[PDB]
From a paper:
The NLR family caspase activation and recruitment domain-containing 4 (NLRC4) inflammasome is a critical cytosolic innate immune machine formed upon the direct sensing of bacterial infection and in response to cell stress during sterile chronic inflammation. After sensing cellular cues, NLRs (including the NLR family caspase activation and recruitment domain (CARD) domain-containing 4, NLRC4) assemble into a molecular scaffold that recruits and processes inflammatory caspases (including caspase-1) by a close-proximity mechanism, forming the so-called inflammasome cßomplexes. We also provide a detailed understanding of how type III secretion system pathogen components are sensed by human NAIP to form a cascade of NLRC4 protomer through a critical lasso-like motif, a ‘lock–key’ activation model and large structural rearrangement, ultimately forming the full human NLRC4 inflammasome.
The huNLRC4-R288A mutant preferably forms a complex composed of NeedleTox, huNAIP and huNLRC4-R288A in equal molar ratios. Cryo-EM analysis of the intermediate Needle/huNAIP/huNLRC4-R288A complex, without symmetry operation, revealed a structure with two apparent NLRC4-like protomers. The quality of the EM density map allowed us to model one protomer as huNAIP with features of BIRs which embraces Needle, and the other as an activated huNLRC4-R288A interacting with huNAIP forming extensive charged, polar and hydrophobic interactions. Similar to the huNLRC4 tri-protomer at the NACHT interfaces, three pairs of salt bridge bonds were formed between huNAIP Lys569, Arg574 and Arg590 and huNLRC4-R288A Asp222, Asp104 and Asp125, respectively. A non-protein density located in the core of NACHT was modeled as ATP, forming extensive interactions with the Walker A motif, and WHD subdomain. The huNAIP has a unique feature that the last eight residues pass through the insertion domain (ID), and pull the ID toward the huNLRC4–LRR, creating additional hydrogen-bond interactions between huNAIP Asp949 and huNLRC4 Gln675 and Arg678.
Author numbering:
A (entry chain U): -8 to 70
B (entry chain A): 1 to 351, 394 to 1403
C (entry chain B): 510 to 616, 644 to 767
The structure:
Amino acid sequence: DYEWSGYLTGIGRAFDTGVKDLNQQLQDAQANLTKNPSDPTALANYQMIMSEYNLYRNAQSSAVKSMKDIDSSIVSNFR
Amino acid sequence: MATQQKASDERISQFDHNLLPELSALLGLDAVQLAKELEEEEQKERAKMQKGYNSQMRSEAKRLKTFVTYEPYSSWIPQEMAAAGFYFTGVKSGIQCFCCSLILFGAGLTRLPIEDHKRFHPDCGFLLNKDVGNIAKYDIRVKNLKSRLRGGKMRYQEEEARLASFRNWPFYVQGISPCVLSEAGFVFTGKQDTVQCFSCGGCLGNWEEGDDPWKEHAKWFPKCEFLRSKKSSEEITQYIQSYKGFVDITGEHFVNSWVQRELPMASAYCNDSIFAYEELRLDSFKDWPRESAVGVAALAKAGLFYTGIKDIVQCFSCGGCLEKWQEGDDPLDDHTRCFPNCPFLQNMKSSAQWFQEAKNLNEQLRAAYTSASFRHMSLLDISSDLATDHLLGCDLSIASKHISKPVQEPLVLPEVFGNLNSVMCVEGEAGSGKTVLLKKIAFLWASGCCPLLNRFQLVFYLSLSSTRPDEGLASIICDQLLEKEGSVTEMCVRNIIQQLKNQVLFLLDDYKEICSIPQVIGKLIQKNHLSRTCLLIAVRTNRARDIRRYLETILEIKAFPFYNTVCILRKLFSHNMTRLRKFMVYFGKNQSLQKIQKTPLFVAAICAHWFQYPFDPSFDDVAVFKSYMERLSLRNKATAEILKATVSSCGELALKGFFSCCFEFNDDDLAEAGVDEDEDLTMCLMSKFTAQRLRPFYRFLSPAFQEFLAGMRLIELLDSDRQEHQDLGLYHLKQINSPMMTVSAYNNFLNYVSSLPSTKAGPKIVSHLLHLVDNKESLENISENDDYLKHQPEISLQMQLLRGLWQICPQAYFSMVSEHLLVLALKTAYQSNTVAACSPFVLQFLQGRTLTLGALNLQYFFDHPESLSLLRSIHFPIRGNKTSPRAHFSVLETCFDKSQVPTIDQDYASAFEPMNEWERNLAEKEDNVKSYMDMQRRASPDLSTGYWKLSPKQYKIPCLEVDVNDIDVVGQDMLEILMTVFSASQRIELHLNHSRGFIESIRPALELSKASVTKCSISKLELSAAEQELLLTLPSLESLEVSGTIQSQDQIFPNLDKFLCLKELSVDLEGNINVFSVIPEEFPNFHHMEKLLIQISAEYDPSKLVKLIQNSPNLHVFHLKCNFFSDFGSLMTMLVSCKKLTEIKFSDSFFQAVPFVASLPNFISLKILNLEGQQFPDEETSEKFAYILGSLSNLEELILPTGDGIYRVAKLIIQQCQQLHCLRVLSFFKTLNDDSVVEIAKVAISGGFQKLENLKLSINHKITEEGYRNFFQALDNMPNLQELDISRHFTECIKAQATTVKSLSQCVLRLPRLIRLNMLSWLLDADDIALLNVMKERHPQSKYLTILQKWILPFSPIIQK
Amino acid sequence: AAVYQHGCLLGLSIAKRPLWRQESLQSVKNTTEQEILKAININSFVECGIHLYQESTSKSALSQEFEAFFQGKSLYINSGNIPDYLFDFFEHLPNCASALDFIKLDFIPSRAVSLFFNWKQEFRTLEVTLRDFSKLNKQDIRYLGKIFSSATSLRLQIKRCAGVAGSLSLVLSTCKNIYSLMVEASPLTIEDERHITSVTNLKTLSIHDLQNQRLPGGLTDSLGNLKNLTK
Ligand SMILES: Nc1ncnc2c1ncn2[C@@H]1O[C@H](COP(=O)(O)OP(=O)(O)OP(=O)(O)O)[C@@H](O)[C@H]1O
Ligand SMILES: [Zn+2]
Ligand SMILES: [Zn+2]
Ligand SMILES: [Zn+2]
């Protein structure tokens, strides 16, 4: 009887907390490049991470719009 | 006269009133901030659209039509708001007044359209009952004023005399010049907008701009002498034939009618009921059993009427009430006292032988239709009591389809009643409401308050359900419509039918076949040109092949709109708002499940359930299906061999269809299922379509229902004791073998299955669901068909994030899915009450698992608490919302690559993108996310509702992982939670991310459970003196980590002799303080460390490290990063005593190479060998190393050193990798060339690298184009490889030829699990990238494989030659 | 697949409008009616095989029967007229298309590029003839170099084109799979001739109507480089 909800809730959060880790990785990569600003592997490892960060932000920035539009369509009917 | 003065209430309608604080509980968002954002948008939109009187929207008949494009999801019915003077606009589902402005958006559950209309602008001329020309939904042009003007015989012969009458011609009709009306012979009567023909005396009203009085005159009263003298008979004929709507009638058919009634003025406060009129309320209160307070005339003025139930007096404007009619009371005060909000009261406070026979029949028919036995049409099977008169405000969605051409158009009832001519038909699915529709029509006619139908003199509602094909009309109507076998005879009826013709309407229900019909009626269908009697026949789509031959168009009933479902529930209930509110949210998010309520019969199914549990504040999404098929047994039952048989056979069809994603069947697919298409029960589950097609097809009622039936059938197979029909259940069950689909595509299926009752199926299903995610073979089975998603947009969205989650953090994905499947298995066991036979599977599953804290709220852990000891850990994260400023772009890369910029030509220029645009676009997208996440509320852990609620005695949580990230200060509730949870565990591990001040507020809890803390990992966290003192009082610490910013020069190192249990030490400080210079000399004694991860610098003869290792025989991981070191050979020698080392990492300028290689053969347990950054400038050392690597048979990760030694002897290293049958990762750095790189491919063919996952080649400065083409064409077999990196530094870009690009695209498709390809500094033109972007769609790992080519360096390349 | 007999070659010579390469290429030799009619006869036969495949919807079920049939056959394609069934043939029946020994392209439309520039497989032989090029662009070279990609062996014929002169060295530079080069009535320069004499893997070289008279380090200056030349 304990609210047996058969649904995958919290996915938006599970995703967002993943992207935030990529952000931390990007900052750390920047620090390593800063200390060795001529190292070709430090550079490659910086843009590979940065591209992924951009790719995923561009994904949730779309999904979040969809989710926002759904919720805003609910509070508008039972105000 | 200034229609309304254009309402403008400061543009602050607001609508809300802080009633949303309870909604955030369901949504997770602050509904208050959200409402504010919406208000702003509405204010802006209003200023961009037109305001003022709109004459075209003057008729409510048209206003209703404008809502045919209104969204199906709402709280208000178009009819309710159309009646309030509103019409639909094209902007964001907003509505607007015809008389007034007042642009209003959305809807509510606690407000009606009229309540808002008079709240945001009470001065509206319409609401105040001023003459604004409002036209009733049901109205006609012919008025029948029955009043003659002055001596027009002479007075109005001249045009001037006629024109002079139009002095007060209302502004609301000034689109038609009075000069035209005058020319046509019309004069103004003084009424709202009617005019009278000066000769004929006929009167027409409801004039609209664009009307032509000569055409209107020709259609009604065509015999008028004036018209005949002025226009040719040909012109008159053309005007009539050129009209639209009425087919064979004129003014004479709307007058002298036996069902006429005068109606007041279409006032605003006339919701949607017949009883809105005083005359109808009063002249119906006839059965009132002489109860005290018999002022019926006064009662009627209270908006009250008799429902037909003993003493229930109902109000047309608010519903059933006044039960037991208090004797001697006053209905105006009782009504007000009980319902002090009713719009009606608010308005009140503010303010010829056959001919005579036909007449007698007419009166009897009217009495039969308005009687309280024809009304209260058993809607929703509520009761014989509990009046449902107020529920007759919902209509059906009707469309008109042509039988020949593929043409379909939407209709509203006012446009149907005006087109009734010869033979018409209404088609629909079983339960669509076609029987109620026919009765409603007969009712409106009898009432007489519905002009447009008042032209009919006789209306007969008959049911051809068992009538024999030889019975005459008199013998039928005397049985079904009249009280006794009298009044009429067969000859009387026939004589009447052939005299009235167009004025006689039959409503024929329950039609089956043309043969099984009374001969007297069949003749009115087959030869309906010698009579012209109007017939309306209602059929199921399972037939409707018999009468199409006699039609032109068909009226088809479409899906019953969601907003009608909401209204019905709102009116019947509302006593339990917490249940209705959940209903609205559920179907808001699950957009495709709105299709469940397709047929009114499903709405009845809900009501029947909601009346049994009126105070249970929960919405069960499958209750409607369980109810629907229960009530099915109360229609026309035959449980044995019929009901069970039809459900079983249909269930088999559904079950097969749901695993091939069919949802559509032909006749052969149906026949093999054993379904009889001519059975009556197999029409309440499924519908047949025989429309203009070469071949027919079958479809189940709204698809969600098919899944329900499939679920039901699967259970029967699993429970049955017949092996022949039982193993089949397992066959179908095993079709679900992908954890990616069990959380999406099959989500609803599984929820229906784990809800229906079962006996043996329970254990059989849970043993599967807990197996699917048990091992790593099925857990990693990422697969989808994408067919089940085509019709379900809400799942397509859900899976958009899951595919992403899997790529960013696979561990999060696996943990999340695993926990979900556990819940479904437990739910199943509890719902079926088979827990005793399911627990063994759960216990097997739980072993070694990690669950979240909230998983302990599951009842299972209370009933069987010993299972807690099987878990490895509980995860308890806290996040708060601390800011992490930014990525900080264009501050480093801007001082790096300048002066080394490449010179790319015009065609390959796209390889390099500008940084300024890259950053701008990213920043915009990031902000759009932040503004949403800020509106979310985490919700503190509800550790009470079963939460390990064993007032814990014998069992404890074996390990608690506390993950603290981006939080500073915890509130009191969190302190209560942390203390409660901490005392419930045996081992506490603290992971502290950037969270300054955190270990100051939870002190009260740590001080009680000091000895339970075993790990403390510190990230970018500043430590205070008080914090360090607390840490030094945690004597049980086994693992201590400091990953940065410890520059406090505090006692954490000086007092590193208190942690006597320490086994794992990890030190990596951004600020270099030469750690170990600060560690006591007594530390390297008795500790026996297992992990040493240290970043050290400027140490000399560091005997402390040597001693620490010497006394650590169980050392597993050794990472050493430092500058100039001493006695390296001694360190390498000492490590030989550590026989269990699995990982070695040496990556700085201290490594001496030779002393390493000499000792390397003594380490045989190594799994990871990382020497990146080291150099081996020696062929002899290199060769020895290369051979040693072949002995290290356990290596998974081999990261090679660089330098000349390896370059010269690289082939040996690659060839020996055929012995290392476990390699997962290989990384090369400037070691391979054109001749040696191909050896990788050769080994893969020979049988090596079979498990390789990551192959990194950044060596590409020493390889030419030929070395890649030859490599790609030689690579056939590496069925584990996920990432292939073949990239170069931007200063040495490679331009690919067509044959190289082609070779690559072929190579990728031979690597079936590849998901990442790196190609930086490769130059491809617009046609080459267009090849790879197509190849991707033929790749097994579609929607994953990503190719990285572009550079984002902060400069423009020189694009010239 | 077992039929080899030509039958009657009399009549139907009007098939394939360029009866004699539009009355241009081919001298007084190889005028034997059979020499040209047999090729036409086969082209029709191969097209018939393709049509039967489409009208069977057998997909991969008959991948062997429809491979044995085509093996050893020829196929002529007009670059200015590419029937859609050729796309289906190359797209849906791989390992068959590669069993053909010719594939001749008569010339640069994007359709020619899209058809050949794919990721499936290389053809045994590809033969390309250029007949109408008064001017050659840079983009034309870029596209042509993609068409040449899908072959294990290239035979290139340049006939009566002047826009190619001075740019031949910019076309052959992308042909590492060329074994036969024929040039007719092209005002080639020394730079082009030096490129030709650099292709040591060339087997067939045929030059017609070259009237430079002065070849200072040109084609006739050495020609001892093409040691693998047979014709
Ligand atoms: N406007 C309405 N509001 C609420 N319920 C409705 C409405 N119209 C129809 N219903 C429901 O429809 C049911 C009747 O459905 P329908 O008119 O399709 O008849 P049926 O079940 O197909 O059988 P038959 O055609 O023999 O009457 C009634 O039980 C009624 O509860
Ligand atoms: Zn208004
Ligand atoms: Zn008239
Ligand atoms: Zn009321």
